[PDB]
Amino acid sequence: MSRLIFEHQRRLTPPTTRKGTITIEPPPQLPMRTEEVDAERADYLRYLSVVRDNVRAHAAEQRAALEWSHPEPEVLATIPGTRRQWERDPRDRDFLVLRAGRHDVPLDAALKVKDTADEIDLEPVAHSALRGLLDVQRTVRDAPTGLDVAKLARITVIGEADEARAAIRAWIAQAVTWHDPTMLGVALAAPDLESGDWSWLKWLPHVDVPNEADGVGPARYLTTSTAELRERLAPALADRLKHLLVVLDDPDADPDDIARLTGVTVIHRTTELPNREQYPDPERPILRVADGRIERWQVWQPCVDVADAMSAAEAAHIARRLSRWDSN
Amino acid sequence: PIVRVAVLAGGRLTEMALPSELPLREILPAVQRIVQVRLSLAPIGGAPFSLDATLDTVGVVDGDLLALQAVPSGPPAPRIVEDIADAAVIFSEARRRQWGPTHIARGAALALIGLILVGTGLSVAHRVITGDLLGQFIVSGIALATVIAALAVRNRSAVLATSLAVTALVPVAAAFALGVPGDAPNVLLAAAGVAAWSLISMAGSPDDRGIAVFTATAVTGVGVLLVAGAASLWVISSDVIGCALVLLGLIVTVQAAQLSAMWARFPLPVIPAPGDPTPAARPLSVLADLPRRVRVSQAHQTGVIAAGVLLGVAGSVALVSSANASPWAWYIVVAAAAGAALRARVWDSAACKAWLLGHSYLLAVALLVAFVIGDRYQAALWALAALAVLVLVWIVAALNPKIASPDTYSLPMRRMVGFLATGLDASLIPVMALLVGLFSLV
Amino acid sequence: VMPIVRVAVLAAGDDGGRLTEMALPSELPLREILPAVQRIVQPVRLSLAPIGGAPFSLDATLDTVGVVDGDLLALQAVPSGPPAPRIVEDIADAAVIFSEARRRQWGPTHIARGAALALIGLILVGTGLSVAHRVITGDLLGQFIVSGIALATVIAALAVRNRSAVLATSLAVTALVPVAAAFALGVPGDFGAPNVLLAAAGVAAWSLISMAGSPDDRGIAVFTATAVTGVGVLLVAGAASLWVISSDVIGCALVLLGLIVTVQAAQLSAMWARFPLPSVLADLPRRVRVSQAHQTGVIAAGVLLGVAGSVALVSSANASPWAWYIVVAAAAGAALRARVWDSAACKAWLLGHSYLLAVALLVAFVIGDRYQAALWALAALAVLVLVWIVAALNPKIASPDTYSLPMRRMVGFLATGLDASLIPVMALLVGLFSL
Amino acid sequence: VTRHQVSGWRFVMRRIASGVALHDTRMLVDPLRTQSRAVLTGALILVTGLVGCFIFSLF
Amino acid sequence: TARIALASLFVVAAVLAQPWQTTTQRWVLGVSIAAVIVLLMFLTTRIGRALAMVRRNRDAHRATVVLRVDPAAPAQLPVVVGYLDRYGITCDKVRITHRDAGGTRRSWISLTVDAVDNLAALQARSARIPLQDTTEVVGRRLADHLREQGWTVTVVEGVDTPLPVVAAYRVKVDEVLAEIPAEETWTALEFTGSPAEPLLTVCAAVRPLAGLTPARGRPALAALNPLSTERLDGTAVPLPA
């Protein structure tokens, strides 16, 4: 009941994201002295190099935007104190977007060649260069990205304890560090919670129901019995707005134990892997948190090339340095 | 009325809630009775709280960290801070470490360098005065020792390795030069050995430290090899080997881009058929290594150019240094000089530009020393005056930063300069034919 | 109680800086105490780092990381991430892009260095050419050209004294080869002793007139070096030209004077501070450097004579073995006197005394038409580089800590006894005290 | 392989050379090709004068 | 070395007199003997010291800070010697001083700071050496550390003088320290060098008891001023436990 207050400040202006649609003039038609076609090759290759530099600029801008919106899961320690802590809003384009790791982004811009010189008999170089540009430059390199949790409704992870829980801690911290509790509320149900593990969650002002006491800490959504968890969660959900997260730590004991909603996106870890899981939905994915990557099940489609792991003590430091503030 | 803090006291910290509107007097005991002299709770790097106040009145927000420590017997130590201006200097202080053992490494390295050099020197002097078997024996011993030591620190230092490999090509050349009786075919063996060692060193090495020096020694070795070859099988005048050397230097300097390109194993183009191919996309692996291949290419290029100049002066000092060579030899010399000083407008890598521009000055020095060796002493003063003119135009270019900038000239002027640079090394070959006597075989 | 450590942190990132002491609880992850340090001394995270090192891991503690009470730690950034490696698929653009980080621009600033180097090479090779024109053949044209280029370069040095302050210093320090050449060719005869006298006089005069006239703190050290030896041999030169023939004693007096300048140096070193080298003590950083410079300069002279004299003792054959004792005595003396100077260049010159001695004996032998001992000089140089190597590998011999206090006392005592032990055998060899 | 293919090959090679030497790929003017072709026409003047003073020598 | 060198020169000019006869190898033998026996350096330098005293019958590079601790004790021995080198200031020497003007053992701590041994840190302050300022700051830091440690200390400005504007002494390796009979007995310890393993020295003064040493050839007593910027030239030696 005794902690500082906060004001729903106006989000800073992020670096711009020019979503233009740059086009490239098609290569020549390859009909005449060879010197002429050589000069034409030179002019076209110069134009292509210029447009390649412009595309590289576009890509660097997009990556700078994603960085400014998804810093590495160790810089966010300096976040909670500044005027940039709960800066995300339910209208922005990156809202409830948990950063999981770096891989190749599809380069939001267009890069559409105005293909009108049909009947492909093009100058071999002036066409090979264009094909190389269209196939290589169209993907930004390793850049922040992750899970648009607001449309997932279930995250099943797979792997050993101290790695699955590692990635879970990483992106749950990345979530609770850029949102007001009035928007999302984290929960948990674990048999061994008070163990230097998720006990750090104790501080997070995102884990308290409205109007409960429990003597010392208001609610402490954390518990062990999943049924008792839903009981403590009973009034919070009849909606099929405030988002939620409900994570689990017991491999067994029936995830999906709530529905099957409209903002309750449960997470759970298992050890059994699917056999021939039919049509991994756009939602409800399945993620093997491997040694150093996070592979999404798809019909093995890494889809995340370098994961993120936040140490237990680091999550505790985040929780502490965050528990000062609150807004009501 | 309660605040949840992390208190600290076995080598760890515990996390408990504590009342706020209360004196610490009745707080600390139970705190101990949870964690387990005048002890109290204090923030990190701060004076302990007044024993008779409340957590609320001191301003400890929920979630802070407090450690249980003793009460200092007296003042609070207000921890006066002093200001500083240029702390970046303090760093440069600690970076400039003392004598220690670090300087001992550079000392030992320079000592070994000097040892090998002076051994080679003493031994070649003994050989060129009166050479017993001991001379060649100790030369070969020193050379084998340094070449083994080069392959002994190959993966231990990667800095001493390349330096030892560089300095080792002097005793190797000395050894293989005087490994055969006589006086010449010796230089053939010498160039062969030095080129072999240069290649071996350049092959198994990281990106740089296989710097221009190595590929330059390699190329000049191949050139001197291909010249001593003709000097061995056939028998030819000084003019023939001079013209061959200057021509090799020119033909290497001119084709020093594609050669440096292929030396670094660039990802050769994949231009497809004209009918209906399927263009392949390059894999990210080699494309990631590319920015290393680029530097390797640059270094190889600078080395090829340096070796081209070393040839184009080694031959240039074979024609004029003789007693009295045809004025065509003088024209070939001046043409190669002006060519290697005008193609210095082409290249852009500053090292290549300097290596090219210097060609004339180095040629002046070489002509001077070859005249002094040949007891000329008369055209030597002329060479000194020519070098004085060279350094004079250098100076007038230095302290007048307009003559050394192409933008202050007219388009047709620089176009005519290009025409001249074309025509010079164009006519360089027919004059070589005239001088060598090729047009006297008909 | 609880183990705490009193440290002092330094953070200078925006304006000026802040250095202040504090008490931090040991056995805590730095990720826990960094916010307190920040709050006290005030998107990138910070961390403690020992000044002159790499930042600490955010998990380790001040105890295990190896911080003693009273250190000085800077507040740096969490080291880094990857540089986000660039990528280009065409090869020509790859070549043009990945080469920029060189300062490869030609510019009107490499031309200056090129012209200066060309001028220095011109001066050096012209002096060499003209000397080799005279010394071998012999005529007035050689010395004429040498003196002409020497006057030219000294006038050029005085002409650019305030033009660039570096071209001037370089031109001056290289101008003392043609000066010596010119002032070494008067009254030819057999080039005698007194030509060395005149050359040393000119060299010392130029070094003096340029040291105080120098525009800054620079390689002025070599100046004072070529100043001290400039006068040193000068004195001895006068003897061999004025008093008597003095056949062999030249090198004896030379090595004596070298040892004198070597040991009793700090006093004469600080003496130059009285001379005019050019806000209460704002010109302290200059002075000390200059001061240090003079030391690192003067000691160099203090060893040059040590060779330049010894080279005379064991030059020829059949020399008295007392010469082969005095040489090694001076060598060992200038070697063991490095333990006290504790500076970089001073220790370097004192150690390299024996190395330069080996090389000089070698070149004098090969000039002296001796080879059954030139190989011996090379072997001594080999033993020397071998002890250098074995010192570099295992820090045992040159580590002044892992020794015995009685052995340290005995080493200092032996050095103090042997460095001066040469003047008795000096008199016994020169016979000056056999009257 | 059509002549356009070999022409493109030579052009890519000369462009790579210009890149690694002149530090630009605009390829407006290519002094490298100029120098190379200059040495080549030197050799061609050589062989032309050769066949000239040869077929004259059989007057 | 110079004195042993000249003594070797003279014993060489003497040893060649194996026939101690002919008054040619005997009179010069005698002059060399009477020149060497007087030197074999405490008598020649005695003449030098007498000439200095008849010559002496008529800084901006070292700064000093002095504090008083009325409840003086050796318990604060470590916390002061630690200041030989810390916080990147490397105080050149520390000095404890005790006086007995009556029975009031007024004591003092004395820190010294050069400007060339730590020119870097000083230059980092203001680009024009705030030597006085930084010395005052390190004095304040030591004062606060001592005060919080359990004593009381006052940063003084201007202290009394152990020289009248009279007999100084020095001892080797505790009981003597309590023994140093007179009216005003000064006793000052000085630690120099490294904080881990320092070099200890001692100078005292009265107005020879068990192991003292007369101060023949007084400017040394002037240097013994706790405020003075000196090193009490007498000796230097490590210490046992």
| CA–CA distance, C238 with C194 (Å, rounded to integer) | 7
The pairing of strands A154-158 and A264-270 is parallel
Pick the closest to residue A244 from A183, A293, A327 (CA basis).
A183
Which is it for the CA torsion A79, A84, A90, A91, positive or negative? Answer: negative
The helix or strand, by DSSP H or E, that contains position B429, with its residue range, turns out to be: helix B411-436
The tokens of A38 are what? 């050589």
* Contact between E217 and E50 (Cβ < 8 Å): yes
Helix, strand, or coil (residue E96): strand
Residue type, E62: R
Geometric angle at alpha carbon A252, from A246 and A256, rounded to 5°:
40
List residues in chain B that are followed by a break over 2.5 Å (C to N): 9, 36, 183
Cβ contacts (< 8 Å) between B266 and chain D: which residues? 16
CA-CA-CA-CA dihedral for C56, C59, C64, C69, to nearest 10: 60
What architecture is the C4-77 domain classified under in CATH? Roll (3.10)
Which are the contacts of C313, defined by CB distance < 8 A and separation ≥ 6? C248, C251, C252, C255, C319, C323, C324, C326, C327
| Cβ-nearest to D39 among B251, B256, B348 | B251
The tokens of B259 are what? 């050669």
The tokens of D24 are what? 């630009």
Which are the contacts of A214, defined by CB distance < 8 A and separation ≥ 6? A220
* b/e map B405-435, b = 16+ CB within 10 Å: eeeeeeeeeeeeebeebbebbbbbbbbbbbb
| CA–CA distance, E224 with E204 (Å, rounded to integer) | 8
Cβ contacts (< 8 Å) between C91 and chain D: which residues? 16, 19
Residues in chain B: 442
Cα of D54 to nearest chain C Cα, Å? 46
* Contact between C411 and C336 (Cβ < 8 Å): yes
Backbone angles phi, psi at C403, to 5 degrees: -120, -175
Could you say which DSSP state residue B100 is in? Answer: T
Pick the closest to residue B422 from D16, D23, D50, D40 (CA basis).
D40
| Cβ-nearest to A137 among C43, C45, C89 | C89
Are C125 and B101 within 8 A, CB to CB? no
Are B74 and E124 within 8 A, CB to CB? no
* Contact between C349 and C225 (Cβ < 8 Å): no
Name residues 19-38 of chain A within 8 A of B (Cβ).
30
Pick the closest to residue C62 from C76, C46, C50 (CA basis).
C50
Pick the closest to residue A264 from A318, A294, A221 (CA basis).
A221
Detail the DSSP E strand segments found in B261-307.
Answer: none
| CA–CA distance, B161 with B109 (Å, rounded to integer) | 10
Geometric angle at alpha carbon B291, from B286 and B296, rounded to 5°:
100
CB atoms inside a 10 Å sphere around CB B7: 18
Residue type, E184: E
Could you report how far apart the first and last alpha carbons of chain B are, in Å? 116
Q: Which residues pair with A104 in a beta bridge?
A: A142
Pick the closest to residue C333 from C314, C313, C307, C308 (CA basis).
C307
Could you say which DSSP state residue B50 is in? Answer: P
* b/e map E34-51, b = 16+ CB within 10 Å: eebeeeeeeeeeeeeeee
Question: Hey, which chains touch D, using 3+ CB pairs under 8 Å?
Answer: A, B, C
Is it true that domain B2-70 has CATH number 3.30.1280.10?
no
Residue with tokens 């490397």: E90
Burial status of residue A251 (CB atoms within 10 A of its CB: 0-12, 13-18, 19 or more): middle
Residues in chain E: 241
| Cβ-nearest to B404 among C86, C95, C111 | C111
* Contact between C111 and B404 (Cβ < 8 Å): yes
Q: Which residues pair with A155 in a beta bridge?
A: A267
With touching defined as 3 or more inter-chain CB pairs under 8 Å, the answer for chains A and E is no
Backbone angles phi, psi at C381, to 5 degrees: -60, -35
Which are the contacts of D13, defined by CB distance < 8 A and separation ≥ 6? B258, B261, B269
| CA–CA distance, C19 with C8 (Å, rounded to integer) | 7
Cα of C284 to nearest chain E Cα, Å? 8
Helix, strand, or coil (residue C7): strand
Could you tell me the residue ranges of all domains in chain D? 3-57
* Contact between A149 and A271 (Cβ < 8 Å): no
Residues in chain D: 59
Could you say which DSSP state residue C412 is in? Answer: H
Are B350 and C106 within 8 A, CB to CB? yes
Which of A40, A45, A50 would you mutate first to test chain D, the one with the most D CBs within 10 A? A45
Q: How many CA atoms lie less than 13 Å away from C347 in the CB half-sphere?
A: 14
Which are the contacts of B184, defined by CB distance < 8 A and separation ≥ 6? B228, B231
C360 touches chain B (CB under 8 A): no
Residue with tokens 């006869």: E21
The tokens of B437 are what? 């006597």
Are D8 and A41 within 8 A, CB to CB? yes
| Cβ-nearest to E150 among B74, B79, B92 | B74
* Contact between E227 and E64 (Cβ < 8 Å): yes
| CA–CA distance, B354 with C107 (Å, rounded to integer) | 12
| CA–CA distance, B213 with B166 (Å, rounded to integer) | 8
DSSP for C267-302, written as a single string: HHHHHGGGS-----STTHHHHHHHHHHHHHHHHHHH
Q: Please report the number of interchain residue pairs, chain B to chain D, with beta-carbon separation below 8 angstroms.
A: 94
| CA–CA distance, C420 with C164 (Å, rounded to integer) | 46
Backbone angles phi, psi at E191, to 5 degrees: -105, 130
Could you report how far apart the first and last alpha carbons of chain E are, in Å? 34
| CA–CA distance, A162 with A159 (Å, rounded to integer) | 9
Detail the DSSP E strand segments found in chain A.
Answer: 23-24, 97-105, 112-113, 140-148, 154-158, 184-189, 243-248, 264-270, 286-289, 294-296
Geometric angle at alpha carbon B165, from B164 and B170, rounded to 5°:
95
Are D35 and B297 within 8 A, CB to CB? no
Are B426 and D39 within 8 A, CB to CB? yes
| CA–CA distance, A100 with A309 (Å, rounded to integer) | 9
| Cβ-nearest to C89 among A132, A141, A314 | A132
A141 touches chain C (CB under 8 A): yes
Residues in chain A: 328
CB atoms inside a 10 Å sphere around CB C328: 16
Nearest CA in chain A to C43: A75
Residue type, D55: I
Q: Which residues pair with E182 in a beta bridge?
A: none
Pick the closest to residue C281 from E133, E192, E92, B89 (CA basis).
E133
The pairing of strands A243-248 and A184-189 is parallel
* Contact between C378 and C355 (Cβ < 8 Å): no
Pick the closest to residue E92 from E188, E190, E192, E189 (CA basis).
E192
The tokens of A30 are what? 């390859």
With touching defined as 3 or more inter-chain CB pairs under 8 Å, the answer for chains D and E is no
Helix, strand, or coil (residue D30): coil
| CA–CA distance, E83 with E94 (Å, rounded to integer) | 8
The tokens of B41 are what? 């709770």
Which are the contacts of B393, defined by CB distance < 8 A and separation ≥ 6? none
Q: Which residues pair with A154 in a beta bridge?
A: A266
Cα B14 → chain centroid: 57
Pick the closest to residue A265 from A172, A166, A170 (CA basis).
A172
CB atoms inside a 10 Å sphere around CB C128: 17
| CA–CA distance, C257 with C303 (Å, rounded to integer) | 10
Method of structure determination: cryo-EM
DSSP for C331-372, written as a single string: HHHHHHTHHHH-SHHHHHHHHHHHHHHHHHHHHHHHHTT--T
Cα of D42 to nearest chain B Cα, Å? 5
List residues in chain E that are followed by a break over 2.5 Å (C to N): 40, 58, 165, 173, 180, 207, 217
CB atoms inside a 10 Å sphere around CB B373: 11
| CA–CA distance, E129 with E120 (Å, rounded to integer) | 10
Pick the closest to residue B217 from B146, B307, B332 (CA basis).
B307
Helix, strand, or coil (residue E94): strand
Which are the contacts of E230, defined by CB distance < 8 A and separation ≥ 6? E223, E224
DSSP for E174-209, written as a single string: -HHHHH---S--EEEEEEEE-SSSEEEEEEEEE---
Helix, strand, or coil (residue B43): strand
* Contact between B207 and B292 (Cβ < 8 Å): yes
Q: How many CA atoms lie less than 13 Å away from C243 in the CB half-sphere?
A: 10
Q: Which residues pair with A286 in a beta bridge?
A: A156
| Cβ-nearest to B426 among D4, D18, D41 | D41
Helix, strand, or coil (residue A178): coil
CA-CA-CA-CA dihedral for B184, B189, B192, B195, to nearest 10: -90
Residues in chain C: 435
Cα of D25 to nearest chain C Cα, Å? 6
Cα C321 → chain centroid: 32
Which are the contacts of E197, defined by CB distance < 8 A and separation ≥ 6? E238
* Contact between A287 and A158 (Cβ < 8 Å): yes
Pick the closest to residue B246 from B307, B312, B341 (CA basis).
B312
* Contact between C101 and A63 (Cβ < 8 Å): no
Burial status of residue C162 (CB atoms within 10 A of its CB: 0-12, 13-18, 19 or more): exposed
Cα C361 → chain centroid: 22
CB atoms inside a 10 Å sphere around CB C315: 17
DSSP for B306-332, written as a single string: HHHHHHHHHTHHHHTTSSS--HHHHHH
Pick the closest to residue A230 from A192, A194, A261, A199 (CA basis).
A261
| CA–CA distance, B77 with C21 (Å, rounded to integer) | 11
Distances (CA, A) of C25 to A49, C5, C11: 58, 6, 20
Are C288 and E60 within 8 A, CB to CB? no
Are B433 and D49 within 8 A, CB to CB? yes
CB atoms inside a 10 Å sphere around CB B164: 24
Q: Which residues pair with E113 in a beta bridge?
A: E63
Backbone angles phi, psi at B421, to 5 degrees: -65, -30
Could you report how far apart the first and last alpha carbons of chain A are, in Å? 12
